[PDB]
């Protein structure tokens, strides 16, 4: 049951600032369950393609997590980057959010007056978010175990116990985060999870932001990112190794996985 899209990867082609496949971007009218949503889809994919939807921390919005949505839509994903409906929501609710723009977007798929209709394999979702929105991310994959990837960045949660996650899920976590910290957030909602396909990739040096528009380690964490939603989204075992390995970069800390075949 594989869903392969774009040619074979390289590492140059998962690091550079775009994929294959054109893409273009809408605002939604009228958002269902969440503030704002800009949805982000490739034109030519050459098939159905599954979504992710992405939300921000406390007191963000959707520029905190643009970048994700070019770099992924071009790889072949329909990506939806959410504002909440208070900046001030909490995990619980920012799930919510999250699982709402995904509806939003198999809505969309099935409404022939959209730019997606017809583009989107609703039975193929992903989740990904920062700080509190990646806390939200986990609680959408704990609730919602047919999710097939999550990739939250620098997790906030005030539970680190994330032991009922089937979903292959990578943690992004920032060396020197100083708001949720990586001993007493992101390390421990890791070493929860003991029942699913996961990756632990510290960035070296890196504070809360680390992984947010305007980076300075895009190659890495979106060749990351992206290697992880098509290992696993798309069951693409071209990105076996991709999604698997140490990548050997002296920008990571610290780099764990566990129950990911290279091959």
Not at 85 to 90: A, H, I, M, P, V
Not at 205 to 217: P, V
């Given at each position: 049951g594989s869903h392969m899209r774009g040619p074979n990867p390289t590492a140059a082609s998962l690091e550079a600032?775009?994929?294959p496949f054109t893409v273009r971007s809408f605002t939604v009218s009228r958002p269902s369950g969440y503030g704002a949503g800009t949805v982000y889809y490739p034109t030519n994919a050459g098939g159905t393609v599954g979504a992710i939807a992405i939300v921000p921390g406390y007191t963000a919005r959707q520029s905190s997590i643009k970048w994700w949505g070019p770099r992924l839509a071009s790889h072949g994903f329909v990506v939806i980057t959410i504002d909440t409906?208070?900046?001030?929501?909490?995990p619980s609710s920012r799930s919510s959010q999250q699982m709402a723009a995904l509806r939003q977007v198999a809505s969309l798929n099935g409404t022939s007056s959209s730019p997606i209709y017809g583009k989107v394999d609703t039975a193929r979702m992903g989740v990904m978010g920062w700080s509190m929105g990646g806390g939200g991310s986990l609680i959408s994959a704990a609730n919602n175990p047919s999710l097939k990837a999550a990739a939250p960045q620098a997790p906030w949660d005030?539970?680190?116990?994330?032991?009922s996650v089937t979903v292959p899920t990578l943690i992004f976590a920032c060396?020197?985060?100083?708001?949720?910290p990586v001993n007493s957030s992101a390390l421990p909602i890791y070493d929860s999870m003991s029942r699913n396909a996961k990756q632990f990739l510290e960035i070296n040096?890196?504070?809360?932001?680390?992984?947010?528009?305007?980076?300075?380690?895009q190659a890495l964490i979106g060749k990351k990112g992206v290697a992880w939603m098509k290992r696993f989204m798309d069951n693409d075992t071209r990105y076996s190794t991709f999604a698997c390995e140490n990548p050997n970069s002296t920008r990571v800390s610290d780099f764990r996985t566990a129950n990911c075949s290279l091959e």
């Open positions: 600032s775009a994929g409906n208070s900046t001030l929501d909490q005030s539970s680190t116990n994330f032991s060396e020197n985060d100083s708001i949720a040096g890196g504070s809360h932001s680390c992984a947010n528009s305007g980076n300075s380690n």
